[PDB]
A paper describes a structure:
The mutant protein solutions were equilibrated against a precipitant solution containing 10% (v/v) isopropanol, 20% (v/v) PEG 4000, 0.1 M Na-Hepes (pH 7.5), 0.02 M potassium ferricyanide, and 0.01 M KCN at 277 K. The crystals diffracted to 1.6 Å and 2.2 Å resolution for the Phe(93)E11Tyr(III)-cyanide and Phe(145)G8Trp(III)-cyanide mutants, respectively (at 100 K), using synchrotron radiation (ESRF, Grenoble, France); both crystals belong to the primitive monoclinic P21 space group. Similar considerations apply to the conserved dimeric assembly; this assembly is based on the following: a four-helix bundle built by the G- and H-helices, the H’-helix, partly the Z-helix, and the BC and FG hinges. In the mutant, the side-chain locations of Phe(93)E11, Trp(60)B9, and Tyr(61)B10 match those found in the native ligand-free MaPgb*(III) structure. As a result, tunnel 1 is open because the mutated Trp(145)G8 side chain is not sufficient to hinder tunnel 1.
In addition to the typical 3-on-3 helical fold found in many globins, the heme group in MaPgb* is completely buried in the protein matrix by a 20-residue N-terminal loop followed by an extra Z-helix and some inter-helical loops with a previously characterized functional role. Thus, the heme is only accessible through two orthogonal tunnels located at the B/G and B/E interfaces (named tunnel 1 and tunnel 2, respectively). Although MaPgb* assembles into a homodimer in solution, this structure does not result in cooperative CO binding.
Numbering used by the authors:
A (entry chain A), B (entry chain B): 5 to 195
Write the structure that this text describes.
Amino acid sequence: KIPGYTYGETENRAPFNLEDLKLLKEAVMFTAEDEEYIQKAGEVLEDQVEEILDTWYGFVGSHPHLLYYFTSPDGTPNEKYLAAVRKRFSRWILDTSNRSYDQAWLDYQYEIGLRHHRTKKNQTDNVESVPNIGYRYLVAWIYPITATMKPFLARKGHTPEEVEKMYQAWFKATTLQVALWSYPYVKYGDF
Amino acid sequence: KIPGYTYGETENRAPFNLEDLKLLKEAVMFTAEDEEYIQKAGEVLEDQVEEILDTWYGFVGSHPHLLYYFTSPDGTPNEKYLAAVRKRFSRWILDTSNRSYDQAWLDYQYEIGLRHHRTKKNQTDNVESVPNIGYRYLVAWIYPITATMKPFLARKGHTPEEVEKMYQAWFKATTLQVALWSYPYVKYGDF
Ligand code: HEM
Ligand code: HEM
């Protein structure tokens, strides 16, 4: 059990459906081939999820304007917030790799969007923190979340081009999701 | 002259400044090393800019829901629109490589955002087309605009490690810009 992790039990239907997903997957050049390799990436990443998260949390920790989004109103880091989110963030690596991308998947993407946005931020862990994460930074994180992953994908001794195929799947999957999470941020009708 | 290309003469000020850019550059892990390598990418790409646009326009052309954003009301591609945008799109490759990322640069990023958004779309070329490019697809394009560039960066005979450095600079620069272009799409206060 992971506190706050409500995959498959959301209680809002995403405003996007499988037809939206098909066309967005096309925009990001994700095909049947990538499903194979994202799943392959999951087998490779399963044991390293703690290292990856340390890398990501280290990036957060070293940037005051990034750590800021986890802070209590007095500017100090909320330790409980960081730790609770970490378990769901870590699980997300595996969900990205293992889940079928169906309507339950989409409904969670919407939920994750809401949690970054002022709509639901700080509700999941019942914490008091900054109200909203500026959208500029979710798009910006496509880079670190994609690029810092690559080394971990090579850690099971796979062939240069196999690593490359897992990386590309990961790059597309990260981009695809961030695009979906923009929904609560974007003016109604502009998404 | 490039019709509709108003870099340095937008006479609207960006709602983001150099301090915002510093913090966004940090989010995207863009440093002085990347300024060197983005500049080097420009030298490599200068000669290849038409074949690059052929590739991107080839992607647009094979997906009806993408070609869509360049269509006249009858659903056929507006040829005047594609051709005029192609010149500004091709110049943007070199601007990304060659310009100082200063307030003049930021002001144009804001203009480019306005041009994909319903605020200014179709005004520059005085064309009749669809009102808005769904923001979901700008984020999504981070993938093809980044990944399809990579082979072009290798055509000047550079080593794979130098190509890798130009490619990483290009990936960060693309992500960085798309993040900025979200401004007119994001609910005020949520960017
Ligand atoms: C590629 C971009 C990003 C990815 C892949 C990502 C991933 C995630 C995931 C998987 C969760 C947990 C979702 C759940 O509750 O199940 C989460 C929540 C969270 N993330 Fe992000 N995120 C991104 C952008 C950012 C940025 C830029 C920040 C700023 C530091 C950030 C800070 C946070 C915070 C504070 C939460 C907890 C939100 C809440 O109160 O529920 N994230 N993120
Ligand atoms: C990484 C994402 C993208 C990049 C780097 C990019 C780049 C550009 C550039 C440089 C221009 C010309 C700007 C100027 O006026 O000087 C432009 C305009 C345009 N682009 Fe994009 N673009 C992206 C996303 C998209 C998407 C997803 C579409 C959908 C097909 C699209 C279609 C168009 C259209 C229709 C225009 C003309 C807008 C107008 O009427 O002024 N772009 N883009």
